[PDB]
Structure 1
Amino acid sequence: QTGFTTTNEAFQKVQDAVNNNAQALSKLASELSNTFGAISASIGDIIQRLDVLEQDAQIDRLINGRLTTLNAFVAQQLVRSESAALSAQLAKDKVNECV
């Protein structure tokens, strides 16, 4: 009871797991919204570049990159959910016998 952060390695593991889920969600989404296009304000050529033709090109590449990044984020979430399901079954077994 007196010591959790230093005495218990397992408590440090809880802190790491909580930090990892929060960091992955916060860092990934912010970076994608952070000017993915080489020269953009998160929207490509909204008014400054050659009217509709330049705007459509820059927006299209930015949208395609965002979609591929979203697919990678979704794949990571699916892997995390699968690992969680296996760990949950192990936790249920520990409660059933050891507890």
Structure 2
Amino acid sequence: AMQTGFTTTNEAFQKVQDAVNNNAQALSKLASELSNTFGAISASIGDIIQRLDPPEQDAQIDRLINGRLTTLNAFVAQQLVRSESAALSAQLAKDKV
């Protein structure tokens, strides 16, 4: 009866897909955040350099840095949360076996 069970009504099966989706979401933060300007004139450092002189160029690059540093800190914080959770879960798996 279980051979045809990997469907929409199988909660365990969705948990498998969700674990997969969580990995994808973690990567989407890095892929999607580089397009943000975080108040800057461009998400491109090259555009900032090409358009502005150092006293203003600096401020614009710095906005991009702050946004990207923030993104990476958030990413890392989640990889640590997710790896801690997975490790606890792994010990549960150990006990079940």
Query: TM-score normalised by the shorter chain: which range applies?
Result: 0.7 to 0.9
Q: Aligned to 1:72, what secondary structure does the other structure show?
A: helix
Residue deviations 1:9-42, cap 9 Å, x none? Answer: 1001111120122123124432234333432142
Q: Point out the more displaced range, 50-59 or 34-43.
A: 34-43
Q: Does the CA contact (< 8 Å) of 2:37 and 2:43 recur in 1?
A: yes
CA drift at 1:8: 1.8
2:73 to 33, 54, 71: 71
CA RMSD in angstroms, aligned pairs only: 2.2
Q: Structure 1 residue 53: deviation in Å?
A: 1.8
What fraction of aligned residue pairs are identical, expressed as a percent?
98
Residue by residue, what CA displacement relative to the aligned partner does 1:58-98 show, whole Å, maximum 9, x if unpaired? 1012112211221111011101010011000010111xxxx
Q: Secondary structure at the match of 2:45?
A: coil
Higher RCO structure (Cα 8 Å, ≥6 apart): 2
Partner Cα separation in structure 2 for residue 52 and residue 45 of structure 1 = 13
Question: CA contact under 8 A between 1:45 and 1:55: conserved in structure 2?
Answer: no
Taking structure 1 as the reference length, the TM-score comes to 0.78
Unaligned runs of 5+ in 2: none
Structure 2 distance, partners of 1:50, 1:6, is 54
Report the Cα distance in structure 1 between the residues aligned to 2:40 and 2:85, rounded to whole angstroms: 36
Count of matched residue pairs: 95
Alpha-carbon distance, 1:50 to partner: 3.8
